[PDB]
């Protein structure tokens, strides 16, 4: 038993809710919150901008030090950093940005990072401002992640579409 509440069980291991991931994180304080990161960990907008704002920019400060030491992530890759006031850890995961021509097949690689964590709160990777169809992102998630994932979808109209088209 865990502290997540109000989710639709899509499968044995995937759950979904209409909520802002930032508010879910503040309420639950999960072990792992997933950020929809870019390779430079420049958290300007979308999920990343919202999470970073909620940390009062501490996420960005930590991220800039990470990049200065290690260089950029790979598309499809990830790193574990602090979750600051939102979670124990933040798993920064880079899904492909189809607006930049990046291979949508890399979305499966991106979701594979989730399997290194038993339970995660997460957004739909590559969707939103990253340009991919959220319906596709949800399907890849279900077909790739085997650990317990709680997906927060802020857009209510999209949530309804994701639910209705699922089975
Ligand atoms: C609007 C930005 C945002 C803030 N907090 C969020 N929490 C969850 N998802 C979010 N955005 N997204 C959707 O709602 C559908 C896919 C895309 C990632 C957000
Ligand atoms: Cl977004």
Curated annotation (Swiss-Prot):
Protein topology in the membrane: Multi-pass membrane protein
Macro domain sequence ranges: 1-167
Activity modulation notes: Inhibited in vitro by GRL-0617.
Catalytic activity: Thiol-dependent hydrolysis of ester, thioester, amide, peptide and isopeptide bonds formed by the C-terminal Gly of ubiquitin (a 76-residue protein attached to proteins as an intracellular targeting signal)
Intracellular or extracellular location(s): Host endoplasmic reticulum membrane
Free-text function comment from the UniProt entry: Responsible for the cleavages located at the N-terminus of the replicase polyprotein. Participates together with nsp4 in the assembly of virally-induced cytoplasmic double-membrane vesicles necessary for viral replication. Antagonizes innate immune induction of type I interferon by blocking the phosphorylation, dimerization and subsequent nuclear translocation of host IRF3. Also prevents host NF-kappa-B signaling. In addition, PL-PRO possesses a deubiquitinating/deISGylating activity and processes both 'Lys-48'- and 'Lys-63'-linked polyubiquitin chains from cellular substrates.
Assembly: May form homohexamers. Interacts with N protein.
Listed name of the protein: Papain-like protease nsp3
Organism lineage string: Viruses, Riboviria, Orthornavirae, Pisuviricota, Pisoniviricetes
Location of this fragment in the whole protein: 1025 to 1191 of 7096
